[PDB]
Structure formats: C-alpha cells, structure tokens
Paper text:
In contrast, the dimer-hexamer clade displays several dimeric enzymes interspersed between hexamers, highlighting the structural plasticity of form II RuBisCOs in this clade. RuBisCO offers an interesting counterexample where homomeric complexes form via solvent-accessible polar interactions, which underpins the flexibility of oligomeric state in the dimer-hexamer clade. Initially, simple mutational experiments were performed using the interface interactions derived from the BRH_c57 structure, although these did not result in an increase in oligomeric state. Thus, we used a more rigorous modeling and scoring protocol within Rosetta to screen 128 combinations of different interface residue mutants, with a total of seven residue substitutions (K98R, A134R, T148R, G151E, G281Q, T282Q, and G358Q) introduced into the I. peregrinum sequence based on the top candidate. The candidate 2-to-6 sequence was then expressed, purified, and characterized by SEC-SAXS-MALS, confirming the generation of a hexameric I. peregrinum RuBisCO. Of the seven substitutions, the R98, R148, and Q282 residue identities were also present in the hexameric sequence conservation analysis conducted previously, while the remainder was unique to the BRH_c57 enzyme. A hexameric assembly was captured and verified by comparison of its SAXS scattering data with the BRH_c57 hexamer, but a second dimeric state was also present in the purified sample.
Numbering used by the authors:
A (entry chain D): 2 to 453
B (entry chain C): 1 to 454
C (entry chain H): 93 to 184
Write the structure that this text describes.
C-alpha cells in the first residue's frame, strides 16, 4: 500500500490547473479482484512516475517532490485522476523541446501491464501552458490548401477529396488515369494508407505520372489540384528520400503536395520526422490501427479524442477524426468535440477545458464510407463544412465514374452550405442525381422518395 | 455488400499456402457485430486489409483481384479467422528495396481495427515466408555480444545479472551515479528506467560522464566488465542520433559496453529502426512500455504479446522484454515461454504457425517485472535455460543491505539454479543470498516456507 | 527552387534592381514600392515566429502584449566574457 505517498485527495483540481505545473490525466480504471481502489490508483501513479512495487534504499525527499499524485477518485464510476509534475517529462538535448514519447511512456506505458489492474484508459488530459509551449505544434492547416485553391482563408469551405481505390493493385498507368479523372471535378487526392512502393507500382515510376495528371487536370479545369503522398517507412532515411523525390518530381507544384504518415503504426517518431524535416509541407496524419485502443469496445490505452488531441502537439496539419457515426467505422455524433478541440483556441473535453495559447489548429479529415448522400447529415451535426473530406467508394463507386463522383461530392457540399435539401438540389445537377442511383440503399434510408 | 465470393476461398489448404512461400498468413480471433454474418464480415475484413472497400469501384481490374487478401479458414463457433496476404501487397524501400514493418501493420492490423461491422479482431499468430522474412533487417547483436565482453562462454554463457536504477524518476546525477557504482560491484548490467533521459533535474550531458566514471571505477575494483543500457528514445530522430553520439563519445574506450534502449511501442517501429540502422554495432534494447494496451489478454483487439515480440525480431531488436511468464508483477502466463523460444531459435512453434528463420540472428529475452533472487529459480524451471538478460529494480535496491548486496543475491540465486542447488541450501553459505529472504519475507514465505528455521 | 519549387528573393532583386542600376543612360533609379500578387507571394517562406512567441514565453497577452523591454550589450565590442555576462545579468 503506497496510498499515503502517491494519493492526495485533498488537492483541488482548480488549484492544480491554476498552478500550471501539472499535466492532469483522467482515467477510467478498475482494479483486479482483491485489490482496493485507492491502493490500486496509488500504485498506478507510482509505476507511472517514480515508484515500483516495493520500497528501495535510493529514494530521497527530492524524488518524492516529483511524484505523480492521485487527487480524485470515484470508485462507483471507475474514475481516477492523476497529476503529473511537469518536471517528470523528457526534454531534447539538441533544442530543449518536449517530446510526446515521454508523455506516453509515463501516462500510458508500463501501467498498461500491471497485474493488479484490470484495465485503465485515458479519456482526457490537460496540458499546462509551460508544457504545451514546448511542443512543435502544427505548422500548416487547411488554410494553406485554401490559399493554393484561392478560396477564403477563413471559412473557405469543404476541400473535395477522395482516396484512390483499389486500396492496392492499381498499376502506375491506371492509377494516374484515375487521378486525372477525379481532379476533373475534385480538389484533393490522397494515397490510400498502404500505397507506396509496391513492386507492381514503384514510387519512382508512379509519381511522375501522378504529377502529369495534376498538371493536365489543372490546365483543363483552370483550378489548382492537391495531392497527399504516403511516405511512411521504418527508416527515417527512407521517409526523407521519398519526400525529397516527390518534391523534385512535382517541381513548381510541390506546394500542392501533402505528406501522409501512418502515425499510429509507425509512431510519433515517424510523425515528428516528417514534421521537422518537411515543415513547409502539409502533414497528413493517417491513424490506421488506432481502433486497437480507441474503440469503445476497449477499456485500455486512450480514446480517439485523446489520440487526436496529442496529434496537434506532434504537429499534424490534419488528422482523421472519423465520420462521428455517419460512416462505416466506429464513431459517435458526440465526436464533434474532437473537431472543436483540434481547430479552436479554446474548447471543452470530457473532463478538462483546454486553451492553446495560439498554437495553430489541426484540420479534421473526414473519411470512411462517406458519399454525397451522407454529407448533409454529417455536417448538420458538426455545424460547419470547413474540413477536408475524402470519399473513396463515394467517388469511384459512382456509376458515371470518378469525375462525376467528384462533382457529386462537391454539389453535396454547396447544397448544405446554402440550406437546400439534397433531393431538391439533385433535380438540377445530374452528377448528384447519379449518386442517388449509385448508392440506392443509402438513398432509400436518407431520402426515401428519391425515385419519384 | 457480401464480398465472400471474391475475398474468401475456403478451399485453399494452409499447407499449400505455406509451401508456395508467397503469402503472409495471419490468424485472428474475430467476432462480427450483431446482425452480420461471420464469413461476409471476414471477407469485408480481408478487403479493408488489402485491396477493397465497402462498395464496388469502377477502377477494379483483374490484376487488382490477383493480389486480394483471401480468407482461407474460418471457425465461427470459435471466432477464428485466417487470412492470406500476397507478399506483393507490402511496401518496400526506394533506397534499398528492403521490407518495412510499418506496412505489414498498416494492412494486417490497421483500418480493420475500426470497422463498424466488427466487434473485435486480434492477431494471435503470423507466418512470414522466406522471401518476405529475408527482406527485414533482423537483429545485428545478441546476448552473445554481451557474453563476449564479459569474457563468458559464447554458448550457454548464462544469465546477465542486471537491474534498473530506481527510483524510476527523481534521482539527481550524483546519487544516480553512486547507485550505479554500488550495483556494478556485484552485478553486470544496468539499464535506465524506461522514461529516464534528460529531465531538468538530471540532464543527460551531466549524468552520462558520471555513469561512465562509475563504470570505470567498478571495472577497476572488480576486474570485470560492466554494461549499461542508455535510453535514447525521442520524437525527433535527430535527437536520437544526438543522444547516441554523445553517449558513445562520453564512454570512449568502453562505448561497446553501452546498449541503446528504445521505448519501441510508444515511439513506434520508426524509432526502433532509426536506432537499429544508425547504431547497428550497439546492442538494441527494445522496451515495450505501453504494449499492454493491446497485448493484455483482457483486450480482444490488436495483437498478442507473442506477435509483438516476434515482430521485434524483424525490426532487429537485440533483446526485448518477454515478461515474467506469470512469475512477476506484470501480466503473464507460464505458457509465454513460447515467446522466448520463438525469439531465440531458428525453428520454433507458434500458436498456429511453425516458423523457420533461415539463420536470422536471434533476439534475447529480457526478464523483468517485480523479480528478485527468490523468484528466479521457479521462473527458469519453466523456461528450461538461463541464457537471458535479467533486470530486477526492487529486487536489487530493495535488498535490506543495499544494491551491491542485491546484485550478489541475484547472481548467487542464478548460479544456484544453474548447478541444481536448492536456493535455501545455497543461502546457507552465501550471506548476500540469505539477506534476500529477509528483504522480501512475503515471497520467502510462499516460495520457501521453512526459510526461517534453516 | 529545383528542390521544392519555392520562390527566391534573390531572383527578384536580380531583375527588379540588378543590372538596371549600372545602365549608362540612366542617372538613377530607386524602388519606392512593390506589389506581390498572391500566386507569387504564396511561394515565399514567410515568418515562422513573431513577438507573439515572445509574449507567450513571457506569459503575457498574445494580443496587445505590450513592449518587450530590451537592450543591446554595450560597448559594441571589447567586453570580455566575464563583464559581458555580468552586464547581461544586471539588465535582466
Ligand atoms: O480505407 C478506408 O477505409 C478509408 O479510405 C475509407 O474508405 P472509403 O471512403 O473509400 O469508403 C479511410 O481511410 C478510413 O475511413 C480511415 O479511417 P478513419 O477515417 O476512421 O481514420
Ligand atoms: O518500470 C518497471 O516496472 C521495470 O523497470 C521493472 O522494475 P522492477 O524490477 O523494480 O519491478 C520494468 O520496466 C518492467 O519490468 C517492464 O515490464 P515488462 O518487462 O513486462 O515489459
Ligand atoms: Mg484508406
Ligand atoms: Mg522500467
């Protein structure tokens, strides 16, 4: 029992916040059978800061000053809050900046394997100014795409995008062909998360072809076109080489290219590798694999809200927030709070209010089983459409091709921005009307009388 | 949309798929959500893990279908799902054509973990065929390199007696270096606790020269080489490189006594590979802090500890924490010994797949987590050998007589097991080991009830 | 740039105020204003930090944070390290 040392329930959360010297974390935790709640929380805090499972002869009074402390519990609700003194976290020797790997190592590291704990999951975290100030933060935003697209730099509207489908299998020539088609009616194309340098579609062969499709589509449409290329790799040198080659290839239009990183499976080190080597390129955070812990089915790790929040510290220009229940992946309408926390200077989490002291915003990237017919309902819940939207099947699954699917996705956006029913808007826009016939199951559910 | 006709081929024989050597096989424990058929859900699973989506797209061609991932076995009653991944699906480096673990994870355990029609899915085993396994870095060093520096036999050299500098955080540079010197008087190996680095109260540039001094002094008085494992984990690879370069420079003539520790689960495979490829001649100490978020048996998602450790060998970890197999404080079971065998043998058996490694270098298990002198004999009885790196933080500095005594007790206990001498009989003629019983009486009572009257 | 396609101020100077400053038939010429259209201005790096970053570190308001009280170490040259560091501490 280490409760006397690592537990101080007499501390008030409002004082700990006002002090600005603690990183607060709200966990949903349940001990194993035969273990008390507070005793378990104190051991949790010990193994997440300075302690072990026994007393050691090397502990001194200074060590006790940086102990993480349990300052609030609710056994009936399985709630536990721990305050981490900021001095616990690692710092770079090259520039003294903070690092996300240290926060994860402590707040959600060895404590996920303790035997006396059934589970524990982070649902919120408060970063004080002196800590948040040390993180890279985003360097670019959807604002940078709006600028290239010559759109309003505030409330510039939805960026009409897609994902090249098939996820894998398209050889270079058909790949660039599909890119050209979508860009005839769309703005943004991203690599599907695993596309890179497969033997049947080498990167050095496909990228010059994608650049040509961009140049052609730009000349025929008179509009700028954006791309997002996957550079994820185990070796940072491979990431750099991919980024360099892609920039030289796209040449004068290199500022039209975002860099995608599978940051959850590759890790924050991959994300920060791209963030610091290519700060002038839009960092597209793809969260493939996050569901292993973020799913509500899981009681361990951290929630999607916390995952996306930490991505703003790492410096993502945009990150996938999910369809918030309107797509094919797990999500809830209340996930709108994730978007607000990423784009605003002041927003509310499940437990903690967070100010960002002017740190740049991260743009929500909405994707996953979406199409023209599903966008109005999704935006009614979010409250605005100033997001990046990518619909793979929603565009190429269009019976009339990707170019019409792109136009249908755009038309769906304007229909919502102006408060016009999608069916009423579909009578004067064949591409949108074709989406209804392309996805009749969705049409029957969202607009029952569409055939008439 | 039922996609079983395309992504499901239950007529394929697993033995043929392994014989062909052209598919990565994965065995999942998967349960669909209510109202979704098992096979149709599994077909969708394979589609979102290879070439497909949730609707038909006009871009699909016959070539695409050729590289589809295929469900070749399902046991609905037992929630089993096996998928075969054509090796051509996975990404390759443009600089050297080598494989990357990030791509395998993106496909085999990426977006499929967020599908709304699946309740959960967890990988329990994976088979890598030769043509794919051959493309991974694999380990460059081993406990054999530690045995060589320690001037011990390079086969069955025995346990490396190690510890973790406790407190986990808070020890300033001077007491830190003092605890290091004391343990090395009786021990072999010291590792940073997983979060120790460049805290403002213990700067790296200040503490590292003191650790090297403690290493030098201990080596001079004991006439034995001493090892240290330094944490270099960071978000920025430039920081990782800077730390490694400074540490190697500081240790100078004893730079080969230093291992580099990387918190590979939270920092990711990119941090592990960054160290593996920049410092291939320094022992790579993979620390898995955070892994329990998926590997815990309580979790039905992600991958098991067995799968996590097996992949660490592909990334090139010289050693990784396999857990205490139920004999320590962390979660584990005695059957986790299969993890060690899969890491250190050229031919081992997994829960579903037998794996040969074609001479790829072994990864050494690291045993840690609430261990001490009393708990080691039972753990090695279950493993069958003591060729591991053992670190006991509380087991060493929790000794009533200090860290030095704790180190001797750990070594003495290991020798006791290696020569088949009961621990209590060994304590009769080794005071340091005897003190370990009094230091941890709750453990002495359980594992050696009659320790007091003897 | 061939490495990233960005603009370079050097090219602007070379053309707008380069060889034209040595012509024999011109007594003098001096730029008093210049307009950069969006498609050109958008290709420049632009500032990455501001006084806002200074206000943040000083824990001041990020809008209308006020004057940053500063000095230049004098003598311009000749202060050895010890007195130089002593002058720094005094002003801070
Ligand atoms: O492969 C996919 O599954 C997607 O392209 C959606 O496909 P479609 O749009 O083509 O149907 C998105 O990447 C995922 O939704 C990513 O997950 P999240 O948004 O949840 O990060
Ligand atoms: O912080 C800790 O808990 C440890 O230093 C153990 O300290 P003690 O020896 O004092 O218990 C190790 O990191 C864990 O053993 C890692 O767990 P695993 O090896 O299972 O990944
Ligand atoms: Mg995708
Ligand atoms: Mg540790």
């Amino acid at each position: 029992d280490q409760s006397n040392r690592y537990a101080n329930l007499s501390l008030r959360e409002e004082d700990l916040i006002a002090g600005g010297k603690h990183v607060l974390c709200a966990y949903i935790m349940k001990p194993k059978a035969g273990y008390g709640y507070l005793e378990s929380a104190a051991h949790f805090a010990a193994e997440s800061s300075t302690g072990t499972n026994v007393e050691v002869c090397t502990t001194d009074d200074f060590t006790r000053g940086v102990d993480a402390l349990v300052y609030e519990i609710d056994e009936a609700n399985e709630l536990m809050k721990i305050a981490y003194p900021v001095d616990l976290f690692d710092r770079n020797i090259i520039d003294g900046r903070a690092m996300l790997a240290s926060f994860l190592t402590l707040a959600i590291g060895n404590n996920q394997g303790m035997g006396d704990i059934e589970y524990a999951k982070i649902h919120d975290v408060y970063f004080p100014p002196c800590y948040l100030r040390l993180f890279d933060g985003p360097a670019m935003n959807i604002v940078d795409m709006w600028r290239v697209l010559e759109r309003p730099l505030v409330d510039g509207g939805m960026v009409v995008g897609t994902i090249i489908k098939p996820k894998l299998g398209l050889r270079p020539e058909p790949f660039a062909a599909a890119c050209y088609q979508f860009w005839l009616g769309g703005d943004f194309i991203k690599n599907d998360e695993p596309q890179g340098n497969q033997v049947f579609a080498p990167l050095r062969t496909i990228m010059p072809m994608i650049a040509d499709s961009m140049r052609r589509a730009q000349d025929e449409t008179g509009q700028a076109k954006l791309f997002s290329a996957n550079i994820t790799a185990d070796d940072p040198a491979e990431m750099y080489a991919r980024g360099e080659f892609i920039l030289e290839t796209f040449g004068e239009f290199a500022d039209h290219v975002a860099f995608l990183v599978d940051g959850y499976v590759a890790g924050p080190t991959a994300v920060t590798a791209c963030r610091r080597r290519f700060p002038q390129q839009f960092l597209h955070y793809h969260r493939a694999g996050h569901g292993a812990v973020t799913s509500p089915q899981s009681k361990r790790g951290y929630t999607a809200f916390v995952h996306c929040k930490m991505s703003r510290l790492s410096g993502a220009s945009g990150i996938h927030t999910g369809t918030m229940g309107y797509g094919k992946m797990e999500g809830d309408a209340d996930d709108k709070a994730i978007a607000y926390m990423l784009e605003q200077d002041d927003a509310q989490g499940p437990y903690f209010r967070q100010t960002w002291q002017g740190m740049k915003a991260t743009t929500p990237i909405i994707s996953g089983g979406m199409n023209a017919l599903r966008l109005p309902g999704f935006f009614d819940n979010l409250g605005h459409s100033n997001v990046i939207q990518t619909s793979g099947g929603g565009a190429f699954g269009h019976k009339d091709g990707g170019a019409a699917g792109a136009k249908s996705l755009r038309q769906a956006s304007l229909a919502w921005q102006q408060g016009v029913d999608l069916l009423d808007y579909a009578k004067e826009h064949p591409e949108l009307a074709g989406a209804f016939e392309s996805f009749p199951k969705d049409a029957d559910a969202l607009y029952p009388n569409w055939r008439e």
